Amino acid sequence: CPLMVKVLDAVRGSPAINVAVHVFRKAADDTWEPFASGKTSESGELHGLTTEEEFVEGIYKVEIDTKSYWKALGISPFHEHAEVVFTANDSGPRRYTIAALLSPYSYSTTAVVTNP
Amino acid sequence: CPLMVKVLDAVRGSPAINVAVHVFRKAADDTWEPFASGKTSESGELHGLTTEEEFVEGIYKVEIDTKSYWKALGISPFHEHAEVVFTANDSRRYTIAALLSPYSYSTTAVVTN
Amino acid sequence: CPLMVKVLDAVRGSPAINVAVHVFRKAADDTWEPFASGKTSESGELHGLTTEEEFVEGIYKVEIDTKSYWKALGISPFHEHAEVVFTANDSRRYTIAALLSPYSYSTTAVVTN
Amino acid sequence: CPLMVKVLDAVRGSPAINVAVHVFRKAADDTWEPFASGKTSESGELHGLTTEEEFVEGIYKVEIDTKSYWKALGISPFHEHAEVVFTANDSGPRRYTIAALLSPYSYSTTAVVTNP
Ligand SMILES: Oc1ccc(/C=C/c2cc(O)cc(O)c2)cc1
Ligand SMILES: Oc1ccc(/C=C/c2cc(O)cc(O)c2)cc1
Ligand code: NA
Ligand code: NA
């Protein structure tokens, strides 16, 4: 799988477990088409969203449902979600790790892009 | 003005100047309606986007054109843009700050008196 | 004043108020000599730490007392403090910003005219 | 090993490879005693710094040599190093991951603390 999402909690110093993630891909008509979804594991990781074959060139949006995560812990957070929008595989196939570090009123995201 | 946007560059240690910023408000049909826009100043700040009267409760999106910023410096960036999506709640000043790198960004909200 | 420190709270979305900040300068014997200190204001800022005359080239450390800040909110934090260590170079205004969470912090430098 | 250090590069979107790391522990006389050191691998990770037996209660400092890392890539960075100072194992043994995300004029650090 060439796409992995990793989420960390900066309040608890832990993986962010059971975080919903929705991935969208921009269609030829400029709409966001559902691409894949899942939720983070006990390690804060979400593996197996897609395959090398399915993960073609395109503009992708990874939506991390931060608000639902914080509400479940009794915190009323600032953001609706964290959205990561990027062009993928435009110089051929790459592996992407999208990491997010969450606080109630802030988040940080980074990408690690590797060439198999 | 109850909304200010501040953009910083983590590579050069400077304000991010002349960055396009677009603000949208979510409509009843779940589409994003253009609300306000501008370019960051020499201080990396964008003031005067809206008024207390116009800035009613609702879901807003701040889109920062990070890709054009990095391309203008000759740096190949990861993201198409940085998006900050939040609910304005009357329960009164919002500063949306973003700290930019080519493959990463950090955003915070400073919500005060 | 060529040095300003700004501290923000990522949990509450607010300035970090009444945070102790200590600045040190590295001496010839590699020890840290006290240089300036204060507490962040209601805006999370600490101004007037030094002067252009005093703030000569050298290695400085800004120590932010994050542990006392979180303990005062009833939150158990990870770090003893946040330390920012940098060289001042005359080749002229330095803002050291820190964004605090209980188990994390982000720091940036904004170095301008 | 109950201590792992992970370093990421926010300019290149990659692990930060060959980053020197020095760990110190506060002695009874309030000095920083050398505890362990090493450098990040091709994955940006540094494993095997210590053992459960050796990693006793104490105040530890993890110094990440960011300046040497950036200078090696032709960037003149702002910070001398990134220092992470924390009390460890004061409620019994824990596993600590210290992560740092680096830019020339900025860094972010977080801890992931797990109970074996
Ligand atoms: O990770 C980070 C994300 C955001 C920030 C904000 C810093 C900052 C600095 C200023 O001088 C004014 C301001 O309104 C904000 C810092 C770090
Ligand atoms: O501001 C930030 C600070 C730290 C991080 C960490 C990301 C990360 C990604 C991994 O694959 C493993 C890991 O241990 C950590 C992300 C953002
Ligand atoms: Na191509
Ligand atoms: Na104890």
Author numbering:
A (entry chain B), D (entry chain B): 10 to 125
B (entry chain A), C (entry chain A): 10 to 100, 103 to 124
Q: Mind quoting what the paper says about this structure?
A:
Transthyretin (TTR) is a plasma and cerebrospinal fluid (CSF) protein synthesized by the liver, choroid plexus, eye and pancreas.
Crystal structures of the TTR:resveratrol complex report contrasting binding modes. Resveratrol has been reported to bind to the T4 binding pocket (T4BP) with rather high affinity. Here we present the crystal structures of wild-type TTR in complex with three trans-stilbene compounds TTR:SB-11, TTR:SB-14, and TTR:resveratrol. A common conformation for Ser117 is imposed when its hydroxyl group H-bonds with a polar ligand as observed for resveratrol (in either pose) and the asymmetric SB-14. Consequently, we selected pH 5.0 as the pH for this assay where the Tm for TTR is 92.3 °C. Resveratrol and SB-14 provided a rather modest +1.1 °C and +1.3 °C thermal shift, respectively.
